Amino acid sequence: QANQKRITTPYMTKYERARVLGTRALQIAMCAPVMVELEGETDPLLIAMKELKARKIPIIIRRYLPDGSYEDWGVDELIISD
């Protein structure tokens, strides 16, 4: 769907918040470039949580509506709950 027609929530669900962190910290474990000047930490999951709080994760999320269509939401484009 177009950027005008985004009918889903502007909030990131707990399931998206889990899976984005998992699939980002896996990438960071495979020597992807970090998007945040880190403070000396080496755990990739803490690095992913830092990028999520920093709102800098380079992933977008495709939400399949039940009719068949979908919406592409940037991680920067929606509200992190915690």
């Binding site: 669900t13 399931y15 984005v20 470039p33 970090v34 998007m35 380079p58 992933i59 977008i60 940037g74």
Partner: protein
């Protein structure tokens, strides 16, 4: 079923930012110099223009 109800795509435009580190050297010009807001109604007592030469 949730973590599986959706699908992830890589945002290549956001991949422009960010860098690998092995750094500890900060990027000087790339910061954001936000200006301070002035909130007064006051009068003038100030100092005139000069030619550009």
């Amino acid at each position: 079923a949730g973590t599986g109800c959706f699908d992830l795509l890589l945002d290549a435009e956001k991949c422009k930012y960010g860098m690998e580190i092995p750094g500890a050297t900060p990027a000087y010009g790339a910061w954001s110099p936000s200006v301070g807001s002035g909130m007064t109604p006051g009068a003038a007592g100030f100092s005139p223009s000069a030619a550009s030469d």
